[model samples]
Target: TRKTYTLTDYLKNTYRLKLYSLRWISDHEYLYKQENNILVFNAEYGNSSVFLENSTFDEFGHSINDYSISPDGQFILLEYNYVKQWRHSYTASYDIYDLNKRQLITEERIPNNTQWVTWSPVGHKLAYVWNNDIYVKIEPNLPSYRITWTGKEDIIYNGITDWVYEEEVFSAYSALWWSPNGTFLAYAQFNDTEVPLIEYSFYSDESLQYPKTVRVPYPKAGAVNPTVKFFVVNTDSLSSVTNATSIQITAPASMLIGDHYLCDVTWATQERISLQWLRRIQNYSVMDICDYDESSGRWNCLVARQHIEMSTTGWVGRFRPSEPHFTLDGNSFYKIISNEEGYRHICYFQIDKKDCTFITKGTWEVIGIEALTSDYLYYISNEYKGMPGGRNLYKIQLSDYTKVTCLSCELNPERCQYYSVSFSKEAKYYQLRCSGPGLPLYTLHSSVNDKGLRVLEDNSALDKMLQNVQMPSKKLDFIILNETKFWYQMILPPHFDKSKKYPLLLDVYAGPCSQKADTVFRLNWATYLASTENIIVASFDGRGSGYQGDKIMHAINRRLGTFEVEDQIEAARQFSKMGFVDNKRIAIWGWSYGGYVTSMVLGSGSGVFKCGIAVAPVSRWEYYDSVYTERYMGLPTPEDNLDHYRNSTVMSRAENFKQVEYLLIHGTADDNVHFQQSAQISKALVDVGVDFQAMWYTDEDHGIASSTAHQHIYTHMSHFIKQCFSLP
Candidate 1:
C-alpha cells in the first residue's frame, strides 16, 4: 500500500531530488562540492581527487559565505560578511588565499563592503568595484590602483549597475567586462542624478520606534531615465603611469540626439569590441564593431561595420537585441534574428557587411546559440517533432548548413525531452541537464564523438522514495483555439477517473512573451493539491506566449491585457467542457505578472472562476517600471498608447470583484511591484462596497521568500482554496 504525498513532505524536502553542481575549470576537468569538500573530477575517466578539504577554512574568523577560484587556479577569493541589497546585488568582504602557499594573504586586502569582484579572463588579475568606483590589482598580493575618480553614492556608478539596470537590463550586479587576454577592462558609468526616487517604509523588529524609509532611483513610465556612458581602460598602462586615463567610446550620432541605453558589451578580440545600443522606445537597436587604434590610443567604429536592427511588429530580441557570437579572428559572427516568416533563426554576418545570411530556417524558433566552434555551431530549440513545449540540443555544420544533427533527442526520448547544456572552455566536453516528465537526469558527454561518458546524477534515490508515495502525473498537450494550437499542461490527481468530475484550478501567467506550459518537472504546491486534495491544476500558454513565432508572441504587443486575459477564460471554458472537470468549482491564481492576469480574469465577470488569488500584481501601466512597461504598453502619454494603457488596468474592473471571491496579497516593501498597486485595487474595491480578503507581509520584498512567510502564505492560500471548493 502506498501513502499520498502530503504538504508536510513537500515543505520539509523529504523526497528532495539531488543535483550535480559543477564548474568547468579546464577542458577535461570540473570541480564539484560534496560533503562540504571540493573535488576535481576527470571527464573521461570519472576519477576524482580532493581539491579543497572541508577543514581548510576552519581557522578563518568570520563565517564564509562563498568562494571563487581564480582563472589560473592559483588562489581562492573568500567572501564573507555578505549583505544582500536587491534581487542580484550584494555587498561582501573578500580575502585572497594562496592555494600554493596554503596561507591567506594578510596585507593589501580587499576593502570591506566591496560591491562586486571578478577574476580576469586569463590570469590572477582582479577587477572589483568598491565604493561605486573601479579598481584593479595585477596580482593577488599587489596594491590596487583606482581607475575612476567620480563615484557618488546615488549620483554616479562607475562599474556597477543601478537598481533599474540591475533588475531589468543587465540581470547582473557588476557592469564591468574584461578583455579576452586581461589587457583591457571595459565598464559602463551610469548617471542617475536627475532620476526620481520611490520611497517606502520598512518596519523592523518591535523594539524599533521609527521605521526606515527606503528610497531607490526608480523610473516609472514616461519618466526621466538614467544616462549611460561607456569607457575602456588599458590595464597594462596602469603600473607605468601615475594616473592612467580611460578612453570614452561615444554612442552613434543618432543615439546621442535622444535617450538611449547601453544594452550589451561583447569583446570580439583583444583589440576589437562590439556594443549594442537601444533607443528609449525600444523598437530600434544598433550594433557597432569598434577596433582599437594603437597609434591614436582610441577606439574607432567605422560606418560600414555598424549594423542596424529594427522591429515593425514588436520590440527587438527577447528583451533587447541578441548578442553576436564572434569567431576566433573576429572577422564574422553569428546571431539569432526573426526570419521573413517571423521565426527566429541563426544569421551569419561579416564585420563589414550590412546584410546577413540566414544559416538556419524553419517554422520553429531557436532558443539560443549555445557554443560555436570552428566546424559546427551548437544551439537549443523546440523543433523536435514540432512540439513547442519540448526542447532539444542540435548542431549544424558551418561548412554545410544542411548537415544538422540532433544531439540529445535520441538519448532517452521517453524520460527526457527538454534539455539544457553547458559546454567546456574549448567545447571538448558538455553536461546535459534533462528536466522533464520524469525525474531530472544529469549526464556528462564528450563532444568529440558525441558519446555519453558517465551519469553525473540520476536521482535514483528520489525515484526509490517515490515508489511508496502516490505522486501526481502531468499531462502536456494542446487545444485548438481559432484554428491555432495553444499549449497547456495539467497536474492530474493520482488514479484520475474520467467518469468522476474534479475541481479545476487555473494557474496562469499570461504576460507578453511568457510561456507557462512546458515539459519541465516540478514538485510545487500544485503537486500537493493534486496528490492530497484531489484538485486538477492547469496552466495555459495563449496568444502572448513565446517560442511559437512572432505571430503568437506579438499578438498583444500594444494591447496589454485584452487577448491574454480573454484567452485564459476561454481555456478554462474549454477545460470545463472536458468530462473530468467540475465546472462549478473552478479557481484561478497567479503571482507577479500572473497575478495581474489572475485579477484581470477573475474581475472579467466571466464566471469561469469561483475564487482567485493575486500576489504583487500590477494595477496600472504608469505605476510599473519604464523599461518593462514601455516595451509592451509604450509611454503612458496622449501621443502613444495612452488609451489602451487606461483601458487595461486591474483597478478599473473593481466592480466585477463582487461576482467572485478574491484574495489580494502584497508586500509592504516590494521594490519590484509597489504595494501602492495593490493598495489602489483594495481602495477601489472598498469604494464599490465590495468585500474581499487582503493580506500584507511586513518588510517583505517582491519574492516573499523568507522562511516563515513562504510557508505561511501557502498555508493561508490552501485554506482559502479548500473553503471555496467545499473540501476538508
Candidate 2:
C-alpha cells in the first residue's frame, strides 16, 4: 500500500543540499542529515554520505558553526567563519576530525577568534572559551593549556560566554563537565565590566553620516547584573586552578536587578549543577541545584528556592532549563513548561532537600519532552481524548506515574508530522522531520522499534498543494491562576456552540522572553480566532512564563506588570469563573513585551481588564532598544530604580485608560518595538480620553512582515475583539 508518488515525483526525488533538516545523533550513535555539505545518513546504503574529495566533505566550507559532536561518536568538532570580532563574532579555528580518517584530531588556531568549543561528555578533553580565557586540550598531544585567565575589560571571563551570557544566558557554549568522567570544567565567570554600557551608534552609511558608538557590555533591566562567579579547572596541571568553594552558586538580586541571564549550566549529578536563576527583581524566580566540589572551590545549593511570582494572571517564562536535568546518584528530573497553576502542563519536578514534586498530574500542556528514561515519559501529548486536530506521542510511567502506552507518531490526517524534535540521549533513538501544509519539507530516518515504525523517507508527493493544509485549533484546559498553575489553550469554534457564551479572546505574551502556551504545528491564531469570529482564544503561561525553572521565574523583575499581570487578571477574573466567560466581553492582546503588557492591563484600572491590542510596545525605558530594555528595565535613572520604571507605566496609568476599548498597532518601521513605542501609547490614549483604536504599517518591520502580514494581524485582531464586544 505505498506507490503513489507525485508532488512532481516528490520534488524530483526529495530535494537536497539542506532541504531544512540539520539533525545529529552521533554520540548516541549514527543519525546524521546535514544535507547542505552532504552527510545524510539513515545509516549507509542510499541513505547517504559522500565525504570523498578534498574531504571536510568537499569543503564548500561553512557548515560547522558551533558544531561539536565527540562523545566517541567518531569525532567531528569543526568550526568555520573562524574569526570576525567587532559587531561581535570572532571564530577561532577549531578541530577534531577522524570521521573514519578524514583525519586532523586536534588543531587550534588561536590569535583571537574561537569563542567556545565544548566536547568532553566522554571524548577525551576539549573545553574552550578564548580571548576571555578558559582553554584546555588535556594530553591530546600536549602544548595546550590555561584553565581560565579573564584579564580583559577588568577580568572578563573563562570557559567562554558573556554579552549577557551570550545574549540572555543560554550559555551559548560556555563550557561544562563531569560525566562519564570529563572531570570538572565547571564554568561561569563574568564581571560585565560591572554592567551598564549598552551604547549602540554604528553608522558607516544607510544615511546618518559617519558615526560609531557600539559600546556593548550592556546589562539594563532593573540594572547591573553580571557579577557571577563559579570556576574550576586543572585538567592535569594546566596550573592550580582555584576559585571554588565547591559550586555554591548565589548570584541573584534579579541576577543583579535585571542584568540577569545565567540561563544554563545543568547536570544534576557527577556532583550537581542546575541553575536557571532569573530574578528581574520584580519578576523574581530562582530554580537552583548547585553542588560540585573540586575540593572546596564550592557551589552547594540544593533546591531551597522556588518563588515564581506574578498573578491576576500572566507574565511567566524564565525557566527554559534543558538537558538530562539529572537522575540517580540522588535523583534529578526536569521540565517545567508552565503557564503556572493556570495549566500549561508538561510538568515534572525534582529537587529533594527543600522539596518540589508534582510529576504530571493533570489537564495538559506538555508540548515537548520528546523522550525520557528511568522508566519512560514520552510527551508531546495534546492529551488524547479523540485527538483535537492531532498531535500525540504520549507515554507515562516514571516508576508509578501511570498512563503509559498511547504512542501515535502521526495519526493520519492523510499524513502527519509537524516538526520540532531533538531527542537522542539514548531514548533508544529519534530525529524525525515532517511538514504537511508544506514547503520543500519531508524528512524522516525513522525508527522506534518494538515492532513498528520504520520508514526512512516518504515525501508524500512533495507538495500536493503542500499536502492538505489548515491545522491549528489547539484545546487543553485548567485555567487555575493564583492558587498557582495555569496551562491554557483554546482555539474554539469549528462549528462551535458547545452551549455558547463566548467573547473571550485573551492572549498575553507575558514576556520574560516567550513560550506562548506551548506545543505547535503552526498556522494558528487560535485557528483564526475560533474559525473566524465565534471567539474564544485563551492562552496562559503565567508567572513570568517559560519552561518553568528558577522558582517559577522570579516575579517580573522590578515588576513587569507584577505577577505577569496577576495571572492574566486571574485568567480573566476566572473568566465567568464558570458561567462560561462573556462578562461584558473580555479582550486582551499583545505584541512587544506584549505591547508592554497590553498597556499594563488597560492602565490597571483593573476592573480586571477589558480591552487591549498593543502591537509594538515598550513606551518607556527612554523608548527601548539599548539591548532589550536595558537588560530588563533598570534605566530611567532618577538615580537607579526610578520608581520601578514608573510602576511599569502605561503612560503613568493615564487615568486608568478612560474606560477602556482597545487597539494600538504599529510598524512605522518598527526596528524592534519602536513606532515610538506605539506612538507613545497612542498619545497617552489620545491625551487620556482613551476609547482607542489605531493601526499603521507604512514601511513595516519588526515582524509585521507584510504581504498581508498574518492576514492583517488577525484581520485587525479579530475585528478589534469583535468591535469591543459590540459597543459593550
Candidate 3:
C-alpha cells in the first residue's frame, strides 16, 4: 500500500517538492529542497515549504503564478502578476530565487506578458524576453543583459514568438535558446510591426462625456505578415553572431496575410540549426526545411525545398511544434507532430551529423509525455483499434513503438476519460488523476517502472456525497458518420427506450478533431438533460473531424459548417431513420466554434432542424482571428474574395431562416471571437422580419455558458428547447 498523501502530506513526507513547481537535481550530491518560501539546503530530509502556500512575499513578492525549475534544481524562477491575454496568460514578472543565499538572483519584468524563460545549457546564465526584446541574465553575480532592443509592441522583439508566432508557430516564450555548451544563445527575431496592426477601439475617459481611444496591436485575417528570422547571440562576449547576415532570414513584410508559419528551430550542432518555414498562396500551403550555418552564415534548403511530406490540405494538421526538447547531446531527433499518414503520431527523427530518420510511427496522437527512460520513451495515445477515436496511455521502447503497453486500465465497455499524469523527477514514480461524468468518483493511482499500481488518494468525501444521488445513463447505439463507422453515443431519458417518444437534444462539438465516437469520459451533462426533461441527447463525429485521416475532415474547406452539418444531418437522418426518435422535434445547440456549426445545421435550407441555439459564434469568417481562420479558410486577402466569404458565411443565408426557434447568446466583451457575429446575424434576422431571442452576457466573452450563474443560462435554454420541440 502506498502512503496516503495529500499535497500537504506529500510536502512533509517526500523530499519536499514545491506545490507550484519543483526541480529535483539528480545530478547533484544531495536534493536541494525548499522550506519557508526560501530555497533551503538539505540532503536526506525534504522541506515542508514546498507544498505549503503559507509562505508570504519577501523572497517572492505577493504570490507566484507559474514557475520554472533549473536543470540542477538549485535555482527556481517564480512568475508573478500573470495577466490573461486572450486564450493565454500574456503578462507576468519573473524573479529568480537563489537557494544558497535565500535571496533573489535577478528579477525580469515584462510590461505585458512573457513566455519561454529558459536557462542556458551552461546553467549559470538565463535568457528570456520582456516586451518583445530578448535579454540574458548571468546568475550568482552578473546582472541581466538586454541583448536585442526590439521596440515595444513594434520592432526589436528579437528571438521570440510574436502573437501570430505563439498562436501559429507553437511556442510561447519565443526567446533564449542556448547552444549545447551554453557558449552561444540562439533566438528568433520578428518584424510584426509590419503585419497590419488592426486596432480594437474602446472608450476610456475621466469624463463620461469625452471619450479617449484605447488602441491594441491586432492582426485580422488576410492581413500583412510577421517577418521572422533566427539569431545567434554570443553568451560570453554578449555579441551578435559574426556571420549573422548569411543566416537564412525570412524578413519580407508579407503582402498577403495567409498561410504563413515559421518555427521548430533546432540545433544540429553548436554553430548550426534547422528551421522550417511555410507559405500559403491561395488555399495551397507549401513547406520547406532549411539548414543554416551560423559559422559560415549560409542556408542549404532541402526536402521541403519544394514540399514537406505533410500538407494542410484535405484535413492534415501542419507539423506545428510540440515542446519535445532536443535530447541532451542534441545531435539527432526529429520532433514532429502529425496525423498525416493516417493517424496522428509523434515522429522521432534520428538526425545524424548529416541525415534524418523517422523512428516512432503509428495511429497515435500523443496526449502526454510522462518520462524518457533509458532506451525507452513513455507516452499516451488516444487509440481505438483504428476506430479513429478515444485514447489510452501507453509506454513503449524507443527502438520500437509497437512494443507498447497500457498504463491506464481499459474502461469496461469504453467511455471517454481524461487523466493528468505527472512523473517523479527521477522517472521512477508516476501519479495519475482520472474522472468523468460518472467515474465512480475520482481515482488516483501511483505507478513505477517495475511496480504495477497503487492507489494514492481515493475520495471518501465523494462517497458520502454520492450516498443520496441517483446517476443514470444508457450507452446508446454508436454509428460511425462515414466508412469504418466511427462510434457515437446517444443518451436517453432516465426512463427511456423504444417504448416512449422523446424530444432530442444533440450535444455536440463537431470539431473534437477526428472522431467524436469515443468511449472515455462520462456523459455528465447529457445525463442531466436526459434526466431533467424527458429528452434524448445524441452526438456524432461529422466528416472533417480530427483523429481520422485528412480526406474526410478537409472536405468542407473554407466552409466550416457545410459538410459537418451534412454529417450531423445524416446523424439526425439516422436518428430520424429510427422509429423511436421524434423526427420533427429534434434540436441542436453548441458554443464557440461548435456554435458556428450549429448555425450551419439549422440554417442550411434543410427544413429538418426544428430549433437551434448558437452561443458566441463566428457568423462570418472575415471577423475571426488571423491565425485560426487563415489556416482553414484560404484567406480574406483580396477584397474580391468577398464573394467566397458571402457564399460560405451562415449569416448571409438569411433567406434560409426556418419556422424553428432560434436563441442567440453572446458576451459583449468576447475578445477572442467578436460578439458582433451574433449581433450582426441578429440584425439580419431583424431586417428579414424574423423573430428570435438574443441574450447578452454583459461581462462575458466566448465562454458565456461556463460563467458564474451558468445554471440560470442552462435553465433558460432548457425551457426554450422544451417549449419549441413540444410537439408530441
Candidate 4:
C-alpha cells in the first residue's frame, strides 16, 4: 500500500501534516485532531470515532484554533480564527458544543474580540478576557458580566498578562486562574503605560499596495516595566457584578516598595494561595503563602514565607526558578536547587519554617519531576554511569528518601537513553517515549504493579528508511577542565580517515548553564555537513555548560562575554590541534544564545577562528529582558556595572570582525530578540567601514521555521559555509 519515496519526499509530505493536539478524555479514551476534525480513540478496544465533524466548523467561517473538554464532560469549547499578537496571546472567537443537547450553538458568544478563554474547574461557568478586560458567564445561555472597568488600550489590563510576564514569567497567555473549588478567580492586572513601544512593518500577502506597521509594547533592560497587581474575584456574586468587591492580595512590603516581578502563582486551596516575587535584578526571590480571612473578606494573613537568595557562586535554579511541586496536603513542596558540591538536587521545603530535607541527593542533576503521588515520587535524572548526556526515569518512596528504584534504566538499557514520559491522570499508567542513539521507540505500561508492556509505536518506517541512507558516525568525548570534564560531541565526515585533514564547523550554544553536547539521535545541519558536504562538525560544552555542576555553569555570571567567549576560542584552538582537523578551515555558528557566544568569539579577533555565523543573537545585555538578563548580569545602570554593559556589547566590537568572515542573520518579526540587535551592529559596521554578509527573514519569528523559508535558509547557509571553507 506504500510506494518507495525518497527522504526529501518523506520530509515534504510528512511535515505538511504531523500528529499533534492530543488530549486525554478519560482513562481509556483520548481525542486528537486530524483532517480538520476531532477523532476520539479508545485504547483498550482499538476503536475510533469522529467526535467533531468539519461541517460543524463551516458556520464559524474560520479554521479551528483550539478546543478543550469541560471538567463536567458535558461540553466542548471551540476557539477559532486566532489573530496572532505576540507569544502565546491572541484574539479569537469561541463556540460551545453541548453534548446532551446534541447541537453546536453558534449564537452564545462570550465577548467580541476575546483574547483568552477558559472554563471553570468544576462547572459550565466560563471566563474570557476581551479588550484587556475580564468577563464571566455563569452558563452557556446566560448573559456574561463584566468584572473590571479599568482596562485601557495601552495602559491598564485585567485578566491578561503584559508582554514580559507572558514571555518570561508565567509562560502562558492568560493571567486568570480559577480556584480548585471554582469559588474564587485569581487574576493579574497589569498597567503598561510606561513601557516603550516597538514598531515594525507587517507585509501581508493579501495587501498588494503597501505594508502596514504595528506597534507592540515592550520593555528592554533598565526600562520601565508594567506595574503588576493581583486580584481575587468572588464568583458567588455572579448575579450582581457591580456589588462584588475585587479583593487585592497584598504582596510583601519589600515587593510593593520597590521594583519586582510577580513570577509564579498557585492556589493551594480555597483559603490558601501562594505567590512568588522576584527582585528587579532577579538575584533574590521570595515565596509568600497568604491565607484568606473569611471574616474580613481579605487576603491579609501571611501564613508562611520562604526567601531564596542566589549564592555569590551562581544564579538560581537551572534556568528560571522552576515552580515547586506541592504535596497532597499542601503543607510542603519539592524543588531543585544547587548543592555545595555543584550538582542540582531535589529538596523538600516546609511551608512554615526555614528547614528543608534533601530528597534526591547525588552528583547529577534532576532534569524534571515526571509525576508525583501520595506514596511515590517519579523523576528523571542524568546520573547514568560514565554517560553525562544519559537520562533515565526513577521512582522512589516519599517515606524513604534514601532509596530510588530505576524504572526505565534496566529495560533495554543498551538501546534507550534519551527518554521522556507521559503519565495518566492517577499515575497508574504511563507512556514512555524513548528517543535514542538508535531509532526512536515508544511503549505504554502500568505504574501500579508490573505487567506486560504494551508496544505503542516503533518507528519501523524510519528505521527501514534510514537503513538505505549513508549516515556519518557520531563520536562523544570530553575536555578536562579544572578537575571537571567538559563534554563535546563530533559528527565525523562520511568515510572519515585518520590520515586526512577535514574542515571543521563548531556548532555552539555556550550560554550560561546550557548543554549542547548530547547523545540524542537528530538529523540537523551537522548531519548534512558530515554526510553530503564532507565536513566535520563538532560541539563543545565548555565553561558555563550545564548538568555537571553549578561551578561550571555559574562561571559566566555577571561576565557574559568573558569566559564564554574565551572557552569557545580555546576550544576551537584545541580542536584545530587535532590530527584530523584542518586548522585553516575552521568556522563557528549558533542560534539565539549560541549566536551571542558565536558573535563574541568571532569578534574577539582570534586568529584561530576563520569565520562564524550568528543567527538571532542578542548584541547587548541592556537590550534583553530584565528577568532573563538580570538573572546572570545583575542590574544594568550607570552606577551599577556600567563598564560591563559597555564592554559586553557586540556592536562595540563590530570593528574587530574585519579579521574574520562573519555572517549575520535574523528575522524581522522576532518578538523574542528584536531585529534591533542586528540593525545596531550593521550601523556600527557601517561606522567602522567594515563590509560583511547579512540576511533578514521578512515577517518571520526568531525561529525562522516556515516550511519554504526554513529549507531555503538552510540551503543558503550551507552554500555560505562551503564558500567559507573553499569547498566545491
lDDT of candidates 1 onward, in order: 0.93, 0.56, 0.58, 0.79
lDDT of 2 by residue, 1-728 (tens): 22221222322333222243444555233433343343535432234554322345455355555555566656666676665432233556665666666566444433346676666777657766667776667634344666555447434766555554554445354545444467666777777766666543444446766665555564544456566665544354445344323333566544555444555556666666566655443234456666655676565664354323232332234333343345556365656444445444544554653344556645544556676667776776545543222355666777776556654554443445344444555565554444432322333333345323344445445334323332224565555454756566666655455566877867778887455664443344555455445567777777766444334454565466677876777777776564656777788888878777777887787776567888877766655533345445545677766777776777877778878777787766544455666766677767857666787865555577555664676666666776777722
CA RMSD of all predictions: 0.9, 24.8, 7.0, 3.1
For lDDT, candidate 2 versus 3, the one ahead is: 3
Candidate 1's residue-wise lDDT over 62-116, tens digit each? 9999989998889999999999999999999999999999989988889999999
Error of 4 at 65 (Å): 3.1
lDDT score for candidate 4 against the true structure: 0.79
The candidate that wins on lDDT is 1
Give one digit per residue, the lDDT tens place, for model 4 in 583-684.
Answer: 999999999898998888888878888888999999998888766787787778777766797799998887788888888999998888988888888888
**TM-score of model number 1:** 0.99
Those runs of model 4 whose alpha carbons end farther than 4 Å from true positions after fitting are 1-21, 26-29, 32-61, 203-211, 241-244, 303-309, 450-452
Among the numbered candidates, top TM-score falls to 1
